[PDB]
């Protein structure tokens, strides 16, 4: 695991997915 402050889990949420999706692509575990 790693420190990432933005690291929320909510699939419906615009947490990063809509703006640029910078870290979901390397994370993959929650979505």
Method: NMR
* CA distance readout (Å), 17 to 3, 7: 19, 12
Q: DSSP states of 6-21 as a string?
A: T----TTS-SSTTTT-
How far apart are alpha carbons 16 and 11 in whole angstroms?
10
15 contacts 8 by C-beta, under 8 angstroms = yes
Residue with tokens 């690291």: 7
């Amino acid at each position: 695991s790693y420190y990432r402050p933005r690291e929320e889990e909510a699939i419906p949420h615009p947490l990063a997915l809509t703006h640029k999706m910078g870290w979901l692509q390397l994370l993959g575990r929650m979505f």
